[PDB]
Amino acid sequence: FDERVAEVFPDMIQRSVPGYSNIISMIGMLAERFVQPGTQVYDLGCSLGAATLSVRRNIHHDNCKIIAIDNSPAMIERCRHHIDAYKAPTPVDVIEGDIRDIAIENASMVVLNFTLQFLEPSERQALLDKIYQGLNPGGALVLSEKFSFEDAKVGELLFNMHHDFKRANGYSELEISQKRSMLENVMLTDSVETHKARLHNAGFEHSELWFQCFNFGSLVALKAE
Amino acid sequence: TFDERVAEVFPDMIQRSVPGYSNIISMIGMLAERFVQPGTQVYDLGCSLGAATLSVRRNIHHDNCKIIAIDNSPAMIERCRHHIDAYKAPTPVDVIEGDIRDIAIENASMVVLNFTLQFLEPSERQALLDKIYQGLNPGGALVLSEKFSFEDAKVGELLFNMHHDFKRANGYSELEISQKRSMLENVMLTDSVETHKARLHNAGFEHSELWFQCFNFGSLVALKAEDAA
Ligand SMILES: Nc1ncnc2c1ncn2[C@@H]1O[C@H](C[S@+](CC[C@H]([NH3+])C(=O)[O-])CC(=O)[O-])[C@@H](O)[C@H]1O
Ligand SMILES: Nc1ncnc2c1ncn2[C@@H]1O[C@H](C[S@+](CC[C@H]([NH3+])C(=O)[O-])CC(=O)[O-])[C@@H](O)[C@H]1O
């Protein structure tokens, strides 16, 4: 099963997460502006390195490193092989491990691309605090998540739109689909208001949504210079 | 002639300068599938060449609907009527040259303001949103897509820079019209998401939320209650 998820992951995420590919492209554009020479980037919950490779293709400074981490050995196996397929001047530390345990040092950029929802709600403040402290001045965090909505009528609409999206995209063709819809119904999501409040609570002077499509989106958080 | 020249290059100009525009058009069509009711009207306000109109129309599977597409640019209208006439569908379209500040909104299951409100003076915007709310049937939807400003200036600067990079990646400046249209864009006054939501609330919408965003451009959906008077 973890290998099966790892095998199909790109196609699964494409068919289930509206705007994913857009976010990944925007992550690259941000990297081009925010990765400073001699600094590092963290990809927290890296899966197969989709965000890592997007950053990496947009770093043209010397002496950087990306640190990519996932606690799934199936994802890590495959991410290390996938990253070895592409040539670039920035090396990557692919580390199998727990994001709640790893230190964040000298970071011009941090990426939580559909990863925070996997922690228990009560552990989410403490990861964000750490990322904040670990970011250099002027550094950026990207936080992409499935959102819940406090207005139940809007929530219903967006749930329906998401369902229509999955239908349009042949989501049910995937063998793994039944077990992934089971995960989504068991997952604990937060609202944008909740995400913003936690970011501010971590120390972030600036945060805003920079992407949304239906019930999925991404915030950018900026540490003052 | 600037009018005719914009209309001629419009699809490419919008594609190179509005991030998310095609995504929004697709979302509009999705929303139409669920929201357009038999025997009702849809309004496309500031229709340009009819892109939003055609997206809705392709997603209407019910009888006795009508779409009303309105713009006050003669060059946009002429081409929009021709563009609509080029595609077969059961739902008819009234293509009207006129001002959306003047037009009545009746029996509407859906109304679309896809990059149009920004072209009115700020002091005209509330009145138009009030009229839309009143003219929507209960359960109906407004789509409001805009270039936003940001109340946090550091975020605003960032998203301004990202928009710049987007236009550069897409060769926007290849277009002869780009210099003049960039300038005219910097003259129309944009509002924050907070302002948009406040306006929607004060027009009477019981529910509203951002449903799309990409950098400094995005889209709100606003719903009239099913039990509304
Ligand atoms: N505590 C944890 N520590 C480390 N990894 C974890 C933990 N909990 C979950 N994971 C890992 O977080 C990843 C989530 S996926 C990220 C997409 C990727 N970012 C992408 O941009 O393509 C999105 C999804 O599957 O919805 C999985 O690979 C888990 O192994
Ligand atoms: N007061 C007015 N009354 C009527 N029309 C107006 C008025 N003011 C401006 N317009 C018209 O509003 C349209 C704006 S475009 C709309 C895109 C379209 N919705 C699309 O989804 O492709 C976006 C852009 O030009 O950036 C133009 O066609 C104007 O002539």
Numbering used by the authors:
A (entry chain B): 20 to 244
B (entry chain A): 19 to 247
Q: Would you copy out the relevant sentences from the publication that reported this structure?
A:
The protein CmoA is involved in the formation of cmo5U and was annotated as an S-adenosyl-l-methionine-dependent (SAM-dependent) methyltransferase on the basis of its sequence homology to other SAM-containing enzymes. Mutations in the cmoB and cmoA genes result in accumulation of ho5U and mo5U, respectively, indicating that CmoB is involved in the modification of ho5U to mo5U and that CmoA is involved in the modification of mo5U to cmo5U.
CmoA has a Rossmann fold that comprises seven β-strands and eight α-helices. There are two molecules of CmoA present in the asymmetric unit that are related to each other by a noncrystallographic twofold rotational axis. In addition to an antiparallel β-­sheet formed by the β6 strands of both molecules, there are additional interactions between helix α6 of one molecule and helix α2 and strand β6 of the other molecule. Together, these interactions comprise 15 hydrogen bonds and a number of hydrophobic interactions, suggesting that the CmoA dimer present in the asymmetric unit may also represent the oligomeric state of CmoA in solution.
